[PDB]
Amino acid sequence: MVPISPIETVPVKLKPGMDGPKVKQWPLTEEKIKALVEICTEMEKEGKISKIGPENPYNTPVFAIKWRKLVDFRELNKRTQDFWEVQLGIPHPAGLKKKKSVTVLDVGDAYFSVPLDEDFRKYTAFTIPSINNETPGIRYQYNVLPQGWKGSPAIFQSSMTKILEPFAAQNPDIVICQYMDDLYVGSDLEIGQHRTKIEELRQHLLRWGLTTPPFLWMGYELHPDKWTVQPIVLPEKDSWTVNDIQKLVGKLNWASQIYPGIKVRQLSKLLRGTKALTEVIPLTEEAELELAENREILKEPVHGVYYDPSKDLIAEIQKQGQGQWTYQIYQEPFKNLKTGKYARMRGAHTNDVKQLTEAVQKITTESIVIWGKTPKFKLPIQKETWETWWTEYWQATWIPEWEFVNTPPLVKLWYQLEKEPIVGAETFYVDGAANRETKLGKAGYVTNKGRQKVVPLTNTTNQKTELQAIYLALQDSGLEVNIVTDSQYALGIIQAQPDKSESELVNQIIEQLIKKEKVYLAWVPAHKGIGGNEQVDKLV
Amino acid sequence: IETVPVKLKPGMDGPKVKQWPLTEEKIKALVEICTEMEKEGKISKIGPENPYNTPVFAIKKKDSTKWRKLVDFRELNKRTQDFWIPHPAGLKKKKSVTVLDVGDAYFSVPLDEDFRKYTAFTIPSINNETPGIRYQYNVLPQGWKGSPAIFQSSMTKILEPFKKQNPDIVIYQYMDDLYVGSDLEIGQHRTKIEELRQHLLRWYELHPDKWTVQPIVLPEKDSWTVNDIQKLVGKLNWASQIYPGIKVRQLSKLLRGTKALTEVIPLTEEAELELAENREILKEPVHGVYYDPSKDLIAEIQKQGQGQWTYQIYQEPFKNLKTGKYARMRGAHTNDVKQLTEAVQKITTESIVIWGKTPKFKLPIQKETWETWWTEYWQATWIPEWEFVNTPPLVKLWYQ
Ligand SMILES: Cc1cc(/C=C/C#N)cc(C)c1Nc1nc(Nc2ccc(C#N)cc2)nc(OCCCN2CCOCC2)n1
């Protein structure tokens, strides 16, 4: 007998202050019991488990579903410690490299052949209820990694990696993976030299006592030359439940990584502050067209390629509209590695530049995760536009190496506040006050040319009138205009430079600013008796 | 030669912090480095029985093309008992202060076996392929708050001759950094440091005297516009939140009526007196400004553009312990974030020299933007805390 190398056990402990499990043994039918006895007999024959005595006060329930043995460690896992992640997060196909051949091997012969730490086997004690409860049920414990235990997958894949590690660094012309009962190896070598190295692998696993396309993997389809997603099934129904929306949304986002032009806003707008599983929710005309467009997008299949490190990596972003963006990543024209989208963050005000920046930062993060590098960017924004923006932007902001692509709609700046007060431009001192309890108030302005206006307002607030007065100052003024205000709120909004807003009031201000040529916007502290800035006209 | 007993704080488990993604070159540099560090017994591969993790990346320092291994021990540090040097208040008063990397010396001291599980970190793989190479520290880990406190004993024994040889040179230790101050001349200073480098082998140059606490100033013009005075009053009103008897009524009186912004308003004698009285007040320091080492130091940075940046350090609003201004050009004219990062380093370094601890920053930058790039320009061995401010502060134009 060729000596099998003993796999060093990983020491396992329970959580501090917690005793082992001690649950009641579930009453079984004589049929189920007769089945488990044979299984646990041949399992004990295979060296998996072993018989124990009354010295083990720990009990773990056991079921039988039809044939197949089921052990419920639901309480031991609540008492077992934590392990390292290993490896919460699957590889993305777009990062893998094209391989000329991929071989499949069985690891169901090897799973159960991974020993368990000795001083922990006493927590895996389970009882097999004898017939009619007329005997102390057969007591047994595990000697290997149980299926369903908290720490089994972590120790399994850990010990597995430790084994393959030498036969991998010595064969750079080979690639391995673990999913899930099987093991997958690939190489670009000759079909002869490949089949050879597979035998070198089987003999390497044989040492530790292991003699054992297209592929469906984690929702993907993996072909030797390309990849895609397993066909997305969108449930068609006149009645749309809340749970069916999240199913629809989730499957759409999944598809958006390779299917370009996927939109998901109108369906996500209908999940705001609602926690239910049953409600036939209607849809707008913007949502019906959206879903009809997605069905038109998913009508023809598209494939992503693999990554070749020898070539540049490029990301291209286009503005879809309504706070939605889409990106495609590639190395050669029209041959995407992957695609994706970005939805604007839930805010009140925003602009295109800030959104484009966010998308880039997302892509950048996503890129480094997959290929371990930052891609070159093709952006729908003129260099000048970016040049003006970041130099003047009150915040710190940055975009990696990039070049402009002339694919409309182009991201631009719609207005720019002056740095210095404008000479020859009329000066509009504005204020806006509102009575807190009666919800009544006024808003208006006075100018250096005698021009005045106060407009009476019902159902409004201070923050709303101070905006309003600026809207009036913008409205009734020349292409150039200075505006003094005392509203740290109103200034704070415009010094954030939005091109779209929730508040229609702000949007109208924005529209006004756009039509202007030069706008200077000064600020003063209120109630300090600053002349021009009149509170006595609006407070009334 | 013997591990000092180290434990965590009451009711706190070890650090379980997610490793963020690293680029290909940084992964290689960490692989190369750790491969050797393993051989030297500094680190040892761990199994899956170790759940904890502390983030780890790699940087490049000045005049060095070799990568350094940076471990963000921020979460592990705040989960250590500490409490094992009263800050040398003479360091901020020396003509020249030199910063040395005494991190290599920590690796000659073994770590308490029971604690090594908390110094777990992970070299990540590209595209989640192979599981991340894991390590734990056997020696004293660089960046750990407990590293200098433990080595504080050994370090005092090392620098015993040099200090008593010249008790005019001040020496301080914070994290992996050793700070050396001297009122000597630079040419003799560098050699005195060169002497201290060979003295350490057998076992960046600041100028704190070229810095004070920046005052608040008002313009001196001969003719004032409405807009000039409106700004002036705005600043004075804000300055009133700090200084006591700041009056603005006589200057506001000039603004009465509704003149054009660019129209020149002549100063009155009543107002000229008021402005003059306001200056005198601003000349005096801030009243009752002390430093309580129990509280947090807060840093606020304002982007002024054209490479200029302003900052303030304080603990209570309108009670600055220090205010400064930067404008350096370290080949970063095209990059705002690199400038911000170099500025954060600078401020933190200065903060270490004065108080012996880093401050908590409030950065004028989107979280998402900062978090993606800051490691790409970081060259310090320590790492402060930071928030993100999203509302454009009006105070920007009051500090310029
Ligand atoms: C073999 C394998 C099978 C499956 C599932 C099958 C089922 N069922 C899943 C994975 C994840 C892998 N693993 C793998 N596969 C490839 N290529 C590849 C080509 C064609 C096909 C097909 N058809 C499938 C895969 N490439 C790599 O990595 C190469 C880059 C390595 N470096 C290391 C250093 O850092 C940089 C990256 N790993």
Numbering used by the authors:
A (entry chain A): -1 to 64, 71 to 216, 225 to 552
B (entry chain B): 5 to 88, 94 to 212, 232 to 428
What does the publication say?
NNRTIs significantly inhibit the catalytic function of RT by binding in the non-nucleoside inhibitor binding pocket (NNIBP). The compounds co-crystallized bind the NNIBP causing RT to adopt an “open” conformation commonly observed for RT NNRTI complexes.
Key interactions such as the 2 hydrogen bonds with K101 are maintained in the RT (Y181C) and RT (K103N/Y181C) crystal structures. Antiviral data also complements the analysis from the structures as compound 2 retains nanomolar potency for the virus containing wild-type RT and variants with Y181C and K103N/Y181C mutations (WT: 0.0012 µM; Y181C: 0.012 µM Y181C/K103N: 0.0013 µM). Compound 2 retains affinity for RT (WT), RT (Y181C), and RT (K103N/Y181C) variants. The addition of the propoxy linked morpholine also provides potential new interactions while improving solubility.
